[PDB]
Design a protein around this ligand. Structure first.
Ligand SMILES: NC(=O)c1ccc[n+]([C@@H]2O[C@H](COP(=O)([O-])OP(=O)(O)OC[C@H]3O[C@@H](n4cnc5c(N)ncnc54)[C@H](O)[C@@H]3O)[C@@H](O)[C@H]2O)c1
Ligand SMILES: NC(=O)c1ccc[n+]([C@@H]2O[C@H](COP(=O)([O-])OP(=O)(O)OC[C@H]3O[C@@H](n4cnc5c(N)ncnc54)[C@H](O)[C@@H]3O)[C@@H](O)[C@H]2O)c1
Ligand SMILES: NC(=O)c1ccc[n+]([C@@H]2O[C@H](COP(=O)([O-])OP(=O)(O)OC[C@H]3O[C@@H](n4cnc5c(N)ncnc54)[C@H](O)[C@@H]3O)[C@@H](O)[C@H]2O)c1
Ligand SMILES: NC(=O)c1ccc[n+]([C@@H]2O[C@H](COP(=O)([O-])OP(=O)(O)OC[C@H]3O[C@@H](n4cnc5c(N)ncnc54)[C@H](O)[C@@H]3O)[C@@H](O)[C@H]2O)c1
Ligand SMILES: [Zn+2]
Ligand SMILES: [Zn+2]
Ligand SMILES: [Zn+2]
Ligand SMILES: [Zn+2]
Ligand SMILES: [Zn+2]
Ligand SMILES: [Zn+2]
Ligand SMILES: [Zn+2]
Ligand SMILES: [Zn+2]
Lengths: 341, 341, 341, 341
């Protein structure tokens, strides 16, 4: 029964490598539940969090991680949505007010009163996590913790981004960047009746793309994505930008078909110059997309449950976390790194 | 009995003054008609064309003008849509192929085989204009030439742009740039049940907006437009950028509410900045819109026929086109200047 | 402080006239609030409730009324959305689970776990009402209780139904039945940029329609609505069916323009024969619409607050309720009857 | 060198057997082409036409067939879209005006000035057919005549119907009637990422559906289809009714999930029942869909070109058309019977 104490990679300074330190096990107060983390995925956003890469930096000291999945250990008072033992996941969208303009219209994702797991509230880089039962993800029974962990963020984000491009079955989607989110985006696009064109700067990643269903591949370092896509398919109906690069964005605009949509999911910093003439005359749409809604999450989880999407995960230990992060900043990760516990 | 010769304003060199000269009156070939210009609107696009601001420039020399309105004076063989004496207008979209992806799906506007009146084909800065009967606008009988001229471009464009915004009745739309396009957008926006926030850089232009239905008025030369819209209404559900300013485009994006849509219609040369991080986290949509479809055009014209939209025009003479364009360069025009032949 | 006892028109038998009987004043338990009813509208659905007109009949004995508006008298424990004294309204949608397929996607209105005010839970035909703070309507400060009461049901229902027809500004909407919901539907349609065609079987009601903005009127008892609408406007883009009649439905289908949408809001019983050939070949859409979502309710309330919609209300006393109901079953009501208290 | 005479199956009286007779081979007038029929699909619409089941009947005598496929044999003057030797098909939508509300908005399908192949104009139950080059389907080069014939109607229709359903990848669609249209709808539905529940009245037809991708199979002659779909999947997000049965239409509506859409494509004569109360409370949408647009047709054909859809066909001879239609009357056809000239 509850260790009363757990280990967790905590962040005390922006840029200062985390430190595994046995800390207290939270207690499920009213409207809360405790989750024993079985697996926990490592998202690129975890780096941006402990690296104070964004305007609203994470209050220190925090525990990152929003791809934490496990069993409901304890149940706070009033909790109806989940019971003890339930296999659940705690995503980026920790909570939302539930009654504002966006929450009432199905866009809780844009709620200004939201909390974010592993950023403004402690996450899954620990053995236990406190979660809001109403925003937690109900996992499919037929998939192991290590496998669905990625869906908790890379999965929903990519799935929702694809919905945001509005590309219909039989059409093309150009996926810029086949990394953590990218290799899983190829699978969702596939399952959504879309022809996939994969763009990256590493042949290994491009190879994985073909294994996953991509019928067109382009190494942006060996050839121009823009004219390759425009020449071979006439422009993609939808474009999903995963790349964190600077040039990737401009090439995404250029790879788009007339009247097509470029869905932005990557979070690079700063303003990006965009061709006025091209966007207006070609009637291009640029859509910003953040993770997913609870409905999006459940839908994204269903695809995994149907076996239509399998994340390419590589195991990792909680203490080797710093090595793992440095590996992602260097882009030396092939797929998604899910922490075992 | 058709002059055989006519006066027209010609652009022979970029940046150079136009020259009023005598040119041969064209004869309607098989699928064409000759329109006798009665009124002709001056659009800022004519400035960009005469100045050679865009990536794709208008071959020289040429006669500008895509807000030309008048009577069908002669009909070529095989023409069926209109007949001699019909009151008709020749807009930016001169023709389209009629059988490509875009043309078949209600987006002839994105057709790659289109021609543009007063740019790639001669336009209305003349006494007569050749035209494709199939793309000409059919004018409402109760509105006078000079008054409906602006709807051939400023009206359709702005109307389709407001539709691309997806703002529904009761919602707010921030319109940046209250000129030829903008002053008419205020009217279409009101007729569409929207609350209007107008942004410009001249108090006289904001007063025109107020007179036309704008509830909130902001002068960007006196205060920060972004914090003004964000402070006074919390951001607009829809934003329509008409302004010939790259920075105005960046500010426009900052005027949107979470989940809002920014329709880009202005064509200043160069690039505009996309704050990816903000666009993503706020779930913003940016949409480039080009003039309007034939269906869009007739719908736009109907609003004018209903008296719901009335362009603010000022008469002009073909011989004074250089000083008129100078007046536009200096932003000294209230609404639109419409040439009368 | 709380009367501890209140009067209320209760229903003890389906068909057996209600009876005003001083009963206990409910106490706001956790997650609840008490509302002192200042005004309470009488909806046609109240008859269907005490007349066991529907499959799932109201548990007896109940207090009908879902257009009850007043002040928040008491606040249960945990309540955050509303404070004591707040002017609020309790609509048809009493509560919903908040985490099901429909609730997560913005359609709480279709929640199978919902409760309905004045049907499955006591309503506003009393001096006080227990409500769920999260589904109650936040009223606009500038409108008196007697006036916004109708919006709590007739308003939102009609507003949402109009949205469901998808008729865009500048287009036509045929409103079949200008009664409780109908006369307020003419105002919303008006405020939504729609041209209104009013259909009824009473000239008095049709007269009110013209006063409210209808530009086309038809007494279905004096002339055929179908050919009148088809001849005068070519078919309405949208049709909103308020009538409880049998023939009204078939005429609504016939009054629709090709590709148009007939939005059903009226709740007559039984199956209605529909022309297969006409619906298929004319690409007609039939949309069932129930009251509104919390977002729809707030949006509908905003129109009243802007003064764009004014319900035509007639005062009534709680004890004269039976007379009032018999008056509605006979169709002798001109507008909406709001109970004073 | 063009026979000058050809064999064709003619309908001279409703209900009476067709007569194979010699008729003059038409000559392409100005905007026409002559197509030499190589394969011709038998559609149930041909039965309704020969039987005179519809409100608007086909003038007698006439040659049915709107799934006629072949080579352009002769071109009239002014024809530009196709040229001699092109593999092309003549569908139900023979021509349209090209400039009305519907034609200009991507809905030429609803054009009031259209003509229908094998109904108001002679069709493919012959060796040659006159056609309007602008509405003919352009066949993929890698698919054989007999195999693509059904896409000219069964395929496009069913494909556009599934789109009208609005069911997105991962969702369920219940397809009622697995015949010519239905067996091909199962394939388009799968290619669109949908889970398929097939309903028919013959086990052999359900087995065909299973082989083509259906997950749930229901025989309406053995069990209540409605409670079966409602029990096994809780209702389908989308429903597509192909069945030549009025009651099947009522049952189809009962197969939808709350908020679901039922696309009506079948054309049995008479009316279908709309349970208004259920449609309203469940927020259901009923949509009538007619064949498909030229854009729809090319998209439908592309799926076939991609090998994602393959019609199950059986060869037939023009001389055996009466026995073939008898076979259809008795529901003894597996998929489609395609005549080979
Ligand atoms: N929108 C959201 O809700 C959300 C959720 C997931 C992560 N994040 C964002 O996702 C991004 C990282 O994705 P992962 O998928 O987490 O990261 P990753 O580092 O594993 O993958 C990025 C991929 O981009 C590719 N790439 C780099 N430059 C490129 C170029 N010029 N052209 C084409 N491809 C290029 C790399 O080769 C790599 O495979 C970050 O910007 C992060 O902040 C956002
Ligand atoms: N996308 C299309 O289909 C389309 C069709 C119409 C015209 N054009 C473009 O519309 C633009 C001009 O519109 P008109 O309506 O033709 O022009 P205009 O010159 O009459 O009006 C432009 C308005 O922008 C205002 N403005 C300038 N700088 C501003 C700033 N920083 N912030 C806010 N407002 C500012 C001016 O004061 C002026 O009122 C041109 O770029 C033209 O090419 C595009
Ligand atoms: N969908 C919902 O959420 C919802 C909410 C409001 C009320 N209800 C339904 O609204 C209906 C009653 O509306 P009110 O607006 O409450 O009722 P009402 O009785 O005041 O008005 C009905 C109107 O129908 C008109 N009418 C009757 N026969 C007609 C015909 N053949 N053609 C044209 N008009 C005809 C009458 O003259 C009358 O004005 C009921 O069916 C009720 O159950 C449904
Ligand atoms: N709306 C359109 O654009 C369009 C275009 C294609 C064909 N048509 C219509 O499609 C229908 C025929 O389709 P085919 O695909 O041409 O016909 P078909 O005869 O090959 O197939 C009809 C199928 O319906 C099944 N069926 C009969 N009764 C049923 C019931 N009660 N429940 C479930 N299934 C039942 C049959 O067993 C059969 O498999 C006709 O009404 C025809 O006119 C319409
Ligand atoms: Zn993440
Ligand atoms: Zn919120
Ligand atoms: Zn212009
Ligand atoms: Zn084209
Ligand atoms: Zn009601
Ligand atoms: Zn619910
Ligand atoms: Zn057919
Ligand atoms: Zn037409």
């Amino acid at each position: 029964t509850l260790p009363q104490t757990m280990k967790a990679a905590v962040v005390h300074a922006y840029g200062a490598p985390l430190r595994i330190e046995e800390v207290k096990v939270p207690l499920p107060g009213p409207g809360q539940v405790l989750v024993k983390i079985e697996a926990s995925g490592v998202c690129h956003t975890d780096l941006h969090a402990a690296e104070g890469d964004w305007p609203v930096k994470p209050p220190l000291p925090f525990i990152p991680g929003h791809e934490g999945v496990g069993y409901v250990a304890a149940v706070g008072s009033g909790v109806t949505r989940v019971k003890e033992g339930d296999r659940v996941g705690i995503p980026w969208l920790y909570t939302a007010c539930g009654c504002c303009e966006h929450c009432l219209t199905g866009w809780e994702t844009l709620c200004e009163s939201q909390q974010n797991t592993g950023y403004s509230v402690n996450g899954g880089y620990a053995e236990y996590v406190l979660a809001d039962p109403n925003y937690v993800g109900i996992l499919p029974k037929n998939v192991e913790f290590a496998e669905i962990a990625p869906i908790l963020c890379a999965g929903v984000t990519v799935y929702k981004g694809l919905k945001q491009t509005n590309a219909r079955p039989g059409q093309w989607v150009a996926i810029s960047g086949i990394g953590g989110l990218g290799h899983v985006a190829v699978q969702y696009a596939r399952a959504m009746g879309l022809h996939v064109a994969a763009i990256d700067i590493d042949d290994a990643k491009l190879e994985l793309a073909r294994k996953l269903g991509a019928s067109l591949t382009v190494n942006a370092r060996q050839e121009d994505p823009v004219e390759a896509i425009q020449r071979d398919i006439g422009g993609a109906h939808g474009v999903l930008v995963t790349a964190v690069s600077n040039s990737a964005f401009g090439q995404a605009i250029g790879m788009a078909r007339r009247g097509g949509t470029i869905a932005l999911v990557g979070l690079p910093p700063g303003d990006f110059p965009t061709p006025i003439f091209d966007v207006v005359l070609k009637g291009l749409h640029i859509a910003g997309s953040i993770v997913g809604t609870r409905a999006d999450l459940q839908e994204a989880l269903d695809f995994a449950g149907e076996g239509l999407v399998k994340a390419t995960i590589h195991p990792g230990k909680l203490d080797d976390i710093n090595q793992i992060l440095d590996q992602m900043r260097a882009g030396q990760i092939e797929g998604r790194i899910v922490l075992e516990m």
